[PDB]
From a paper:
The ring-shaped chaperonin TCP-1 ring complex (TRiC, also called CCT) is a ~1 MDa hetero-oligomeric complex that has a double-chamber architecture, with each octameric ring formed by subunits CCT1-81–3. TRiC-mediated protein folding depends on an ATP-driven conformational cycle, which regulates the opening and closing of a built-in lid over the central chamber of each ring.
However, we could not detect any density attributable to the NTD. We, therefore, performed focused 3D classification on each CCT subunit. This analysis resolved an extended helical density that can be attributed to helix 3 (H3) of the NTD of PhLP2A adopting two different orientations associated with either the apical domain of CCT3 or CCT4. Notably, only the apical domains of CCT3 and CCT4 were predicted to form a dimeric complex with H3 of PhLP2A with good prediction scores, in agreement with our cryoEM density maps. The charged H3 residues in PhLP2A that contact CCT4 are also highly conserved. In the open state, the PhLP2A NTD adopts an H3 extended conformation to apical domains either CCT3 or 4.
Numbering used by the authors:
A (entry chain D): 26 to 533
B (entry chain Q): 66 to 232
Write the structure that this text describes.
C-alpha cells in the first residue's frame, strides 16, 4: 500500500533529520561547545561530530545507516565526516517535498544519477592540478597543506612531524600501498621533544633480565608463544601435608620437568627467547632463568598481540606455540642489540634487522613531559593520513564555499537547459547543494543571506572568486588566505552521499 | 663454583615454596549484598559470631551507627561484620522500621533490635553500644553497670530516704 511506506519513510526521515541537527552546529573551525552527560555521573566538552555520533545511538536502522556512512567517510578520506551528513540531510529534506509532489522513486533515482554525473564533471573541471613526482613537488605540496592545516604554532616550532614522518615513511615508495601497520609507532616518557629519530628496524621497550652482560649479535632470538610454568597439581594440597613424605617425591619430578624442557629448546641456537603475556601461565619459573644464565641468556617477556603480528611481519620468523614443533621457521638474521636510556628515560632497544629487506620503519617520541607523549602523539597519525591520501589524487581545490555555490549555479543552468520531467529534480538538487557557506557565516557570526547572494553573484561573474575568510570575517580569495584541500575528499563525499540517498529512497 | 651455584636451587626452590602453607584470621568490615545471606546460617563457620545491619538513606541516625561498628571491629578481630541495603530483603517492612542487627551464632537470631526508641536516639556512644552487647567476647571493659543512671523523678525517692535513715 501507500500508508505503511509513507509512514515508515516519514519516520526514517524524522530520525535522520534529528540525528543530523544534533551535531549540525559544529562544522568548521568555529564549532561551538557542547556538553553531553552519559547518565553515569560524567560530563564531557568537545566539538567534533565523529566521536559524539559514535558514543550514542538510537535502536533504529536509519541511525545505523548514517553511523556507517560517517565511519566509511572517515576511513576513506579522514576528514569532512560532519559535512557528509549535512549534505545527506539536505537531500532528505528536499526529497520529502519532492515525493510530496508525487514522483516515482525510479525517476528521482535516475535524475539524481544524471545530476551526479554532471556535478562530478563540473568539480573535476573546476579544480586545478599539481605535481607529485619528486621530493620537491611533494615537499611544497606538504608545505601548502601545513599552512592550510590547523594552526601550526607548535608544529612550525617543534616539528616532530614536518620531516620525521614524511621522510621516514617515504621508503615503501610504491603508489597506494602504505598500510598503517607499516608505521607502528612507539612512545616513551622522559627526555625532550627536541629529537624523534629513525631506525630501519623494530624497537622494543621493556625490562630484559639481570645477569652479567647482554650485548651481542647472532641469529635471531626466536619467537615463542610458549608457557614454562608446570601445570598446577590436581589438588590444592597433596595427599598428606607434612615434611616426611611429599618432599622426597615431588622434588625430582619438578627438577626434571623444569630442566628437560630448556634442555630440549637448547637444541636450536642463540640461547635467547621472547614470550607472550602471562594471563593464564601462573607462577613463572626462576630456576629456568638461573639455568639460562649458565646458557648465555638474553630475553624479553610479555609481548603483545598487535606486536606479535607486526614483528612476525618485520623479521620473517613464523611463530611457535609449543616445544614439539621446532623444525624450521624459527630464526632470522640480526645485527646488534642493547640500546640504553640515553640522555633520558623510557628504556628501549634498537634491533636493526636487515633480514627481510621488505620496507618497514618506526617512530619514537621521547620528551621532558608526559604531556609531550600527549601533545606530539597522533598528530603524525593524522598528517600521515593526509600525506597518504595525496599519493593518488595529485589535485587540490580551494575552500571557502566557492565550489558549493559554483556547482549550484552550474546545476541550476543544467536544470534550465534539460527541460523535462527531470529538470525540477535536478533543480532541487542544485538548491539543496548550497547550504554550507551560510552555516560558516553563522559559525563566524554574520547575516548569511546577503553574503551568500553576493558570493553567488561574484561566481556568476567569474566562476572562480573569493571564498570565506575566517580571519577577518570578510570575502577574500583563498589564493592569499591559503586554505586548500585535495579533490577526493569532496568527490568521494558527493558520490557516496548520492549513492546512499538513492539506496535509502529506493527501499520501501 | 657450579655446586654452590647450582645447589642454591634447593636453597631457593622448596624454600619460597616452604612458605606456601597459609592460614588466616579476620579484620575490618566487608560490604555484602544479599547474594550470600541465604546459606549464611551454614556459611557461619565454627563459633564465628557475626553481626548484621540494615540500611536506609536520609536518616540522621542511620549514618551514625554505621561508623561505630567499623570502629569496634578494629578492637575485636575474631568477630566479623556486614553492611546491607533493605531493598535486597522484604520490600515494605524496612521503610517504616529502623536498623535491626540480627546477630547469628551460626543459628537462630538472638537479639533483634527494631525501631529507633530502643537505641536511645543519637545519645549513643561506644559505651551504650558495647554493654548492650554483653554476649560476644567476655571483656566489656569490666563495667558493672552504666545506664547513664536514667535521670530521676524527684517525688519517689523522698519517702525512701526517710524510712531507711530513720528506721
Amino acid at each position: 500500500d501507500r500508508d505503511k511506506p509513507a509512514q515508515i519513510r516519514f519516520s526514517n526521515i524524522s530520525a535522520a533529520k534529528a540525528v543530523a541537527d544534533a551535531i549540525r552546529t559544529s562544522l568548521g573551525p568555529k564549532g561551538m561547545d557542547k556538553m553531553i552527560q552519559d547518565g553515569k555521573g560524567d560530563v564531557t566538552i568537545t566539538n567534533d561530530g565523529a566521536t559524539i555520533l559514535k558514543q550514542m545511538q538510537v535502536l533504529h536502522p536509519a541511525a545505523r545507516m548514517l553511523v556507517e556512512l560517517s565511519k566509511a567517510q572517515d576511513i576513506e578520506a579522514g576528514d569532512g565526516t560532519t559535512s557528509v551528513v549535512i549534505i545527506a540531510g539536505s537531500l532528505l529534506d528536499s526529497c520529502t517535498k519532492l515525493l510530496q509532489k508525487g514522483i516515482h522513486p525510479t525517476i528521482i533515482s535516475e535524475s539524481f544519477q544524471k545530476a551526479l554525473e554532471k556535478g562530478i564533471e563540473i568539480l573535476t573541471d573546476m579544480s586545478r592540478p599539481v605535481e607529485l613526482s619528486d621530493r620537491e613537488t611533494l615537499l611544497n605540496s606538504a608545505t601548502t597543506s601545513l599552512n592550510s592545516k590547523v594552526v601550526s604554532q607548535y608544529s612550525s616550532l617543534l616539528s616532530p612531524m614536518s620531516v620525521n614522518a614524511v621522510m621516514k615513511v617515504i621508503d615503501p615508495a610504491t603508489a597506494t600501498s602504505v598500510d598503517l601497520r607499516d608505521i607502528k609507532i612507539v612512545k616513551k616518557l622522559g627526555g625532550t621533544i627536541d629529537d624523534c629519530e629513525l631506525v630501519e628496524g623494530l624497537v622494543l621497550t621493556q625490562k630484559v633480565s639481570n645477569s652479567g652482560i647482554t650485548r651481542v649479535e647472532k641469529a635471531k632470538i626466536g619467537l615463542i608463544q610458549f608457557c614454562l610454568s608446570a601445570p598446577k597439581t590436581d589438588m590444592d594440597n597433596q595427599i598428606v601435608v607434612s615434611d616426611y613424605a611429599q618432599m622426597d617425591r615431588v622434588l625430582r619430578e619438578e627438577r626434571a620437568y623444569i630442566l628437560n624442557l630448556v634442555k630440549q629448546i637448547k637444541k636450536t641456537g642463540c640461547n635467547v627467547l621472547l614470550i607472550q603475556k602471562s594471563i593464564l601461565r601462573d607462577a613463572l619459573s626462576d630456576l629456568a632463568l638461573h639455568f639460562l644464565n649458565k646458557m648465555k641468556i638474553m630475553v624479553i617477556k610479555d609481548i603483545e598481540r598487535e606486536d606479535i603480528e607486526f614483528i612476525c611481519k618485520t623479521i620473517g620468523t613464523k611463530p611457535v606455540a609449543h616445544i614439539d614443533q621446532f623444525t624450521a621457521d624459527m630464526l632470522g638474521s640480526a645485527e646488534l642489540a642493547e640500546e640504553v636510556n640515553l640522555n633520558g628515560s623510557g628504556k628501549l632497544l634498537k634491533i636493526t634487522g636487515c633480514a627481510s629487506p621488505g620496507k618497514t620503519v618506526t617512530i619514537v617520541v621521547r620528551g621532558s613531559n608526559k604531556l609531550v607523549i600527549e601533545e606530539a602523539e597522533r598528530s603524525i597519525h593524522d598528517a600521515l593520513c593526509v600525506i597518504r591520501c595525496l599519493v593518488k589524487k595529485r589535485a587540490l581545490i580551494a575552500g571557502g564555499g566557492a565550489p558549493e555555490i559554483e556547482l549550484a549555479l552550474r546545476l541550476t543552468e543544467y536544470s534550465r537547459t534539460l527541460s523535462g520531467m527531470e529538470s525540477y529534480c535536478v533543480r532541487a538538487f542544485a538548491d539543496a547543494m548550497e547550504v554550507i557557506p551560510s552555516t560558516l557565516a553563522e559559525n563566524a557570526g554574520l547575516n548569511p543571506i546577503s553574503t551568500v547572494t553576493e558570493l553567488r553573484n561574484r561566481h556568476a561573474q567569474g566562476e572562480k572568486t573569493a571564498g570565506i575568510n575566517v580571519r577577518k570575517g570578510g570575502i577574500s580569495n583563498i589564493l592569499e588566505e591559503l586554505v586548500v584541500q585535495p579533490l577526493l575528499v569532496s568527490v568521494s563525499a558527493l558520490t557516496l552521499a548520492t549513492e546512499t540517498v538513492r539506496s535509502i529512497l529506493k527501499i520501501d | 663454583e657450579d655446586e654452590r651455584a647450582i645447589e642454591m636451587y634447593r636453597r631457593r626452590r622448596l624454600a619460597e615454596w616452604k612458605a606456601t602453607k597459609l592460614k588466616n584470621k579476620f579484620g575490618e568490615v566487608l560490604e555484602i549484598s544479599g547474594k550470600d545471606y541465604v546459606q549464611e546460617v551454614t556459611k557461619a563457620g565454627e563459633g564465628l559470631w557475626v553481626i548484621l545491619h540494615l540500611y536506609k538513606q536520609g536518616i540522621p541516625l542511620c549514618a551514625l551507627i554505621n561508623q561505630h561498628l567499623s570502629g569496634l571491629a578494629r578492637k575485636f578481630p575474631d568477630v566479623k561484620f556486614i553492611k546491607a541495603i533493605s531493598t535486597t530483603c522484604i520490600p515494605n517492612y524496612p521503610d517504616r522500621n529502623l536498623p535491626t542487627i540480627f546477630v547469628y551464632l551460626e543459628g537462630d537470631i538472638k537479639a533483634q533490635f527494631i525501631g529507633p526508641l530502643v537505641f536511645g536516639g543519637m545519645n549513643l556512644t561506644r559505651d551504650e553500644l558495647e554493654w548492650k552487647l554483653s554476649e560476644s567476647g567476655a571483656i566489656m571493659t569490666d563495667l558493672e553497670e552504666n545506664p547513664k543512671k536514667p535521670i530521676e523523678d524527684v517525688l519517689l525517692s523522698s519517702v525512701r530516704r526517710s524510712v531507711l535513715m530513720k528506721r
